[PDB]
Amino acid sequence: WIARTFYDGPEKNYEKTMAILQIEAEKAELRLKELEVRRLMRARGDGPWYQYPTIDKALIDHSPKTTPDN
């Protein structure tokens, strides 16, 4: 009666633990991958992150400058 009224079968806890383990293992893998990706982008600078600004090329004046040799 106690088991019927208050508790649940072993399979429920078993499968819930499987799901929790899957979720947290995926999270750990994603954390390692994030660290590696951050290191690579900061070292190289070829990704969307760590893009430090440079001078805009639309600021340059392309017109004769009173002197042929600029």
Which parts of this chain interact with ligand PLX (CB under 6 A)? 6-8
d(CA 48, CA 23): 27
Question: What is the token pair recorded at 38?
Answer: 């951050």
Nearest approach in angstroms of CB 8 to ligand PLX is 5
* Residues in the chain, total: 70
SS3 at position 66: coil
* Closer of 9 and 48 to ligand PLX (Cβ): 9
Pick 12 or 31: Cβ nearer ligand PLX: 12
Is 8 or 29 the residue whose CB approaches ligand PLX more closely?
8
